[PDB]
Design a protein around this nucleic acid. Structure first.
Ligand SMILES: Nc1nc2c(ncn2[C@@H]2O[C@H](COP(=O)(O)OP(=O)(O)CP(=O)(O)O)[C@@H](O)[C@H]2O)c(=O)[nH]1
Ligand code: MET
Ligand SMILES: [Mg+2]
Ligand SMILES: [Zn+2]
Lengths: 77, 249, 396
RNA sequence: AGCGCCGUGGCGCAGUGGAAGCGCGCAGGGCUCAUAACCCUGAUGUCCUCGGAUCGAAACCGAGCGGCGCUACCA
C-alpha cells in the first residue's frame, strides 16, 4: 500500500511520519502556489497546489521524506 | 392511488415542518406538491429560498426530489400553502427527515392492502388511522408491538382481516457483549460449556480463546440487556468457584 | 509416528522450509501475516516418509521402473528452526530437541555465512555431531565455482567438533537427488538409546489454542501442545503436570489429565520417544493461547520436579564471538549483567550473583524445574541483540 | 476456516424499500475583446448473481459469489 499519485493538482496518498502544516509551509514557499490541506472523509488525504509543476512536486517529495521514487506514478492529465 | 394524507386532516397546520417534492418553477419561485401533507400545492418564494446568495437556482432546488422546509401560513378555505425553506433549525432538520421517513413507511404499509384487494385506499386508511397515529405516537412502534404481540390492529375493526393478514405476511435487534476469560485454573472448559448450556437454553458464539461474544436477538432493547447481565453473572458465579476468574467490560 | 528428531539450519534468505517441503511434503504455514516474508517466530514442523527400496516419498514405488515397492523402514519428524539474529531462544529450544542436523551453505554468497556457522556452533554445543553439509544452491553455480566452494567448505570445516560431515547437493525447486538425503539420514544418523528404562519426562516447545470460532461452544476441545520426550513412552490415561506453571514474582504448578495424543497422523495410545507429539489435555486454552507453553518442562505424575530460582552452573565460553561478518574478543563475565541462560528449551534471562572463571551462580526471574542435567546455552547483550557466548550446565 | 463491510458511471459517496441516485470528473455551449472564474446541458451502468414477500423493486430478508478487519493457523 502507501501508494501516492498526483492528479491535476492534488496529491493523494501521503505518509504521516511528519507533521502536515510544516509540509504546507515548505510547499507554498518552494512552489509559490496556493496551498490547501483538504481532508475528505476516508479518501487519500488531499494536498492541493496550483499550477503544472509536477517536476517541482517531484523535487519537493524528494526533499521532504521521499527516498523510494518508485511507487510514484503521476498521471499526466 | 397515492392519496389520503398521512395525518388526521388534509390541511396543514400553522408553522409546521414538512419535506416537499419539487415539480416546476415558473418565474418567481416554485409552487410544488407536498408528500408530507395532502398533495395540495405549496409555494416557495425566492426571498426564502437559499441561505447563500441567489446566483444559481437549478442546483439548490433540484427539481424532483425531497427537501426539508417549514410551512408559514395555510389557506384552508380553497387551498393555498405558503411554504418556507430557510428558518429551519439545524436540529429540527433531523426531525423533519425522520418524520418524513415515518410517514413514507406508513404510506408504503397501507398501499399493499388497497392494491391487493382493489378497495378504496382512502376508505381503508380512514378506518386504520384512528388508532394508528393519534394514540400516543407514530405507527411503527405500534406495528412492531403488534407483530410481537397483536394489540393495536384490534383497537378498531378494519374492513376485513385478509388485508391485515397480507400486512402481517409482508412484515414477516442484536445486542453485542464481550466476556474475557482470565482463567488460570486447570479445568475451565467444562465450566464454560456448562454455563453456556444453561444460558442458551439467546445466541452466544466464539471469537477467541478468552473472548466469548454474545449477540442476543432482543425484541425490546431492555430484555436483551437484562438477559445479557444475567448470563454475565451466571458466568462469573460458575467460574469464580472452580478455580478461575473471568471479567466483562 | 516419529522415531528420531531432525532439524535444519541455514542463513537468512537461504532456503530451508521449501527444502524440507521437498524432503517431507508438509507445507510450512509461516502464519501471523508478517512471518510470510521476513522470518518466522514459531517453529516449523514436517513429517518424512522412509520406505527404502533395496532391489522414497511413497510407501509404494513405481518411479524406479521395476514394479517393486518399498517396505517400512523409518518415519522421522523434522523441526524447522529459524536461523535469524532476532530469535535465538526458540532456536536453542529446538536445538536441544533435535537429534539429527542438516546445515545449509550458500555458494555465491559469502562462503562463511555468520548464522550458518553460529548455528553450527550451537549444534556442537548440545551434543550434536552427526551433521550433513548441504549445498542448498546447486543450479546457481558453475562447475569450477562449485569446486571452489567445495574446497572452501572443506578447508573451513576441518578441526571443529563436527568433523565427519558428509556433503550433499540439494535444491528447493528441482526435487532430485532426494533419496540420497534419506539414505544418508538413515546411515549416518542412528536413533539414540530410548527405551522403557529411563523415567518418562516431557519438554513442551509450543502452545496451540484450539477454540473453533463460529461454532457452538457447547463442544470445544481443550489445550493441545507440542512436546518432545527424551526418555520413556507416554500412554493414554495418565495424570500429567506442567511444572513451570502459572503466575499467581512466583509460579505454581499446573495439573491436568491426558485427553488425546496426536502422533504424526492420528491419535495413538502409545508413542516411542524421539518425536514431536501433540499432547491434548484438559488445560485451559488461554494457557495455550500466546507464547506460553514455549520451553516448559513437564512431568508425568509419580515424579517431583524441583523448582529452582538460584542455580549453580558450570559454564564455558569460546575464544571469539559468533554471528558477525565487526567482531571482538570474548570478554569474561561481569557481575550485575542480565544474561540469557536457556536451560535446553527455557527462555529466561538470569542475573549473575557469583562470578568464577569456570563456575557461576545465577538467579532466574521466573523459577524453573531441574531434574537431571538439562543442558544450557548462554547468550549476552553485545550487538544490540542476543549473542551466543558459551554453554552452561546445571550442577547442584 | 468463521463473523462484520465493500458490491459502480473512470472515480468517493447516495438512498436503499415509486424505477435511474450527488459531486468529482470529461465533451460541447453560454459569459468576456480573450482567458481563468462563473453559468447550462451531457454519455457513462448489469449498485455481483439466485430467490422470497412484493400492483411496484438495486433496496427488506435469506444461500451462493470477488476482495477487505480480527480470531490467529484455532491438534
Ligand atoms: N533458486 C532457488 N531459490 C531458493 C532456494 N532456496 C531458497 N530459495 C528462495 O528462498 C525464498 C524462500 O524460501 P524459504 O525456505 O521459505 O525461506 P527460509 O529458509 O524460511 C528464510 P530463514 O532461513 O531465515 O528462516 C524463495 O524465494 C526461494 O526462491 C534454492 O535452493 N534455489
Ligand atoms: C507440534 S507438531 C507435533 C505434534 C503433531 N503435529 C500432532 O498434531
Ligand atoms: Mg515455518
Ligand atoms: Zn518459479
Amino acid at each position: 500500500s502507501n501508494y501516492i499519485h498526483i492528479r491535476i493538482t492534488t496529491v493523494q496518498g501521503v505518509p504521516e511520519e511528519y507533521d502536515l502544516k510544516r509540509i504546507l509551509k515548505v510547499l507554498k514557499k518552494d512552489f509559490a502556489c496556493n496551498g490547501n490541506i483538504v481532508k475528505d472523509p476516508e479518501m487519500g488525504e488531499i494536498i492541493q497546489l496550483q499550477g503544472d509543476q509536477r517536476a517541482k512536486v517531484c523535487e519537493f517529495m524528494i526533499s521532504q521524506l521521499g527516498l523510494q521514487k518508485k511507487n510514484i506514478k503521476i498521471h499526466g492529465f | 392511488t397515492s392519496h389520503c394524507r398521512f395525518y388526521e386532516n388534509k390541511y396543514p397546520e400553522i408553522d409546521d415542518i414538512v419535506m416537499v417534492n419539487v415539480q416546476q418553477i415558473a418565474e418567481m419561485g416554485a409552487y410544488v406538491k407536498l408528500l408530507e401533507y395532502d398533495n395540495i400545492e405549496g409555494m416557495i418564494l425566492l426571498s426564502e429560498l437559499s441561505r447563500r446568495r441567489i446566483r444559481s437556482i437549478q442546483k439548490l432546488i433540484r427539481v424532483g426530489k425531497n427537501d426539508v422546509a417549514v410551512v408559514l401560513r395555510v389557506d384552508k378555505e380553497k387551498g393555498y400553502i405558503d411554504l418556507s425553506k430557510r428558518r429551519v433549525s439545524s436540529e429540527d432538520i433531523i426531525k423533519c427527515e425522520e418524520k418524513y421517513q415515518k410517514s413514507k413507511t406508513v404510506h408504503s404499509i397501507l398501499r399493499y392492502c388497497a392494491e391487493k384487494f382493489q378497495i378504496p385506499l382512502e376508505e381503508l386508511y380512514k378506518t386504520i388511522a384512528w388508532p394508528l397515529s393519534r394514540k400516543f405516537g407514530h405507527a411503527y412502534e405500534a406495528f412492531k408491538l403488534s407483530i410481537i404481540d397483536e394489540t393495536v390492529w384490534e383497537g378498531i375493526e378494519p374492513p376485513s382481516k385478509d388485508v391485515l393478514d397480507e400486512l402481517k405476511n409482508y412484515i414477516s435487534v442484536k445486542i453485542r457483549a464481550d466476556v474475557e476469560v482470565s482463567c488460570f485454573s486447570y479445568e475451565g472448559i467444562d465450566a464454560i460449556k456448562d454455563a453456556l448450556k444453561s444460558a442458551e437454553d439467546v445466541k452466544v458464539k466464539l471469537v477467541a480463546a478468552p473472548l466469548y461474544v454474545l449477540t442476543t436477538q432482543a425484541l425490546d432493547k431492555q430484555k436483551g440487556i437484562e438477559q445479557l447481565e444475567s448470563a454475565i453473572e451466571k458466568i462469573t458465579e460458575v467460574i469464580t468457584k472452580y478455580g478461575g476468574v473471568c471479567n466483562i467490560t | 509416528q516419529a522415531t528420531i528428531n531432525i532439524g535444519t539450519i541455514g542463513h537468512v534468505a537461504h532456503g530451508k522450509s521449501t527444502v524440507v517441503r521437498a524432503i517431507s511434503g508438509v507445507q510450512t504455514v509461516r502464519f501471523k501475516d508478517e512471518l510470510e516474508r521476513n522470518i518466522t517466530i514459531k517453529l516449523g514442523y514436517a513429517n518424512a516418509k522412509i520406505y527404502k527400496c533395496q532391489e522414497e516419498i511413497s510407501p509404494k514405488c513405481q518411479r524406479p521402473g521395476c514394479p517393486g515397492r518399498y517396505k517400512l523402514v523409518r518415519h522421522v519428524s523434522f523441526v524447522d528452526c529459524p536461523g535469524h539474529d532476532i530469535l535465538m531462544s526458540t532456536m536453542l529450544s529446538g536445538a536441544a530437541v533435535m537429534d539429527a542436523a542438516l546445515l545449509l551453505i550458500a555458494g555465491n554468497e559469502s562462503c562463511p555465512q555468520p548464522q550458518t556457522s553460529e548455528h553450527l556452533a550451537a549444534i556442537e554445543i548440545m551434543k550434536l555431531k552427526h551433521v550433513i553439509i548441504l549445498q542448498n544452491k546447486v543450479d546457481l553455480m558453475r562447475e569450477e565455482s562449485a569446486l571452489e566452494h567445495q574446497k572452501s567448505i572443506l578447508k573451513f570445516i576441518r578441526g571443529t567438533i563436527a568433523d565427519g560431515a558428509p556433503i550433499v547437493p540439494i535444491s528447493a525447486q528441482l526435487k532430485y537427488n532426494i533419496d540420497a538425503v534419506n539414505e544418508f539420514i538413515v546411515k549416518t544418523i542412528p536413533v539414540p538409546p530410548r527405551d522403557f528404562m529411563i523415567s518418562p519426562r516431557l519438554i513442551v516447545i509450543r502452545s496451540f489454542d484450539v477454540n473453533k470460532p463460529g461454532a457452538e461452544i457447547e463442544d470445544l476441545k481443550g489445550g493441545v501442545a507440542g512436546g518432545s520426550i527424551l526418555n520413556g513412552v507416554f500412554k493414554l490415561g495418565d495424570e500429567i503436570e506442567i511444572r513451570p506453571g502459572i503466575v499467581t514474582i512466583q509460579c505454581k504448578p499446573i495439573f491436568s489429565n491426558i485427553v488425546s495424543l496426536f502422533a504424526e497422523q492420528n491419535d495413538l495410545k502409545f508413542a516411542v520417544p524421539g518425536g514431536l507429539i501433540g499432547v491434548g489435555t484438559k488445560v485451559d486454552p488461554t494457557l495455550c493461547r500466546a507464547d506460553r507453553l514455549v520451553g516448559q518442562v513437564v512431568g508425568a505424575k509419580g515424579h517431583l520436579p524441583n523448582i529452582y530460582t538460584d542455580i549453580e552452573i558450570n559454564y564455558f565460553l569460546l575464544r571469539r564471538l559468533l554471528g558477525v561478518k565487526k567482531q571482538a574478543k570474548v570478554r569474561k563475565l561481569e557481575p550485575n549483567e542480565v544474561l540469557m541462560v536457556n536451560i535446553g528449551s527455557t527462555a529466561t534471562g538470569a542475573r549473575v550473583v557469583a562470578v568464577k572463571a569456570d563456575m557461576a551462580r545465577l538467579q532466574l526471574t521466573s523459577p524453573a524445574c531441574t531434574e537431571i542435567n538439562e543442558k544450557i546455552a548462554l547468550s549476552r547483550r553485545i550487538e544490540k541483540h542476543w549473542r551466543l557466548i558459551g554453554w552452561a550446565t546445571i550442577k547442584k
